[PDB]
Design a protein around this ligand. Structure first.
Ligand code: R27
Length: 107
């Protein structure tokens, strides 16, 4: 449902743990490589917690594997993203997504 391909390594030691908030930057693209969203465009890190349905499942399972400082490409099947529906005006139906995600820090 999610493949993780590292772009730049993290420290390999500091992973998200229960009660912590992940602070990330991301860019989301479709399979054709075209961007549909990026926190870097608005220069606003995205904060979320694991275990609360705060993100699509591909992020839930992918970012949980990342360590602080890591930049990774997450390739997410529709089951782990927006499935047959998509997201109105942004993501088409049945869309495999590619996110470039950087774990900036844990809070
Ligand atoms: C009150 C709600 C506002 C609230 C919005 C924010 C905290 C802002 C946050 C940065 C999201 C971005 O705002 C510019 C947008 O980012 C994307 O462009 C993106 O790149 C993108 O894919 N993501 C953003 C970065 C993480 C991975 C992923 C993600 O998981 O996004 C959450 C989301 C829409 C989950 C669905 C939720 C329902 C559930 O059933 C579905 O299961 C199939 C999944 C999103 C964090 C959600 O949990 C919280 C919200 N939702 N608003 C909604 C749904 O309208 C997606 C396509 C759309 C997002 O705007 C809604």
């Amino acid at each position: 449902g999610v493949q993780v391909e590292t772009i730049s390594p993290g420290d390999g030691r500091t992973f998200p743990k229960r009660g912590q908030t992940c602070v990330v930057h991301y860019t989301g693209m479709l399979e054709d490589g075209k961007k549909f969203d990026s926190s870097r465009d608005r220069n606003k890190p995205f904060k979320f917690m694991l275990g609360k349905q705060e993100v699509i499942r591909g992020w839930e399972e992918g970012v949980a594997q990342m360590s602080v400082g890591q930049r990774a490409k997450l390739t997410i099947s529709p089951d782990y993203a927006y499935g047959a529906t998509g997201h109105p005006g942004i993501i088409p139906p049945h869309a495999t997504l590619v996110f470039d995600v950087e774990l900036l820090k844990l809070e």
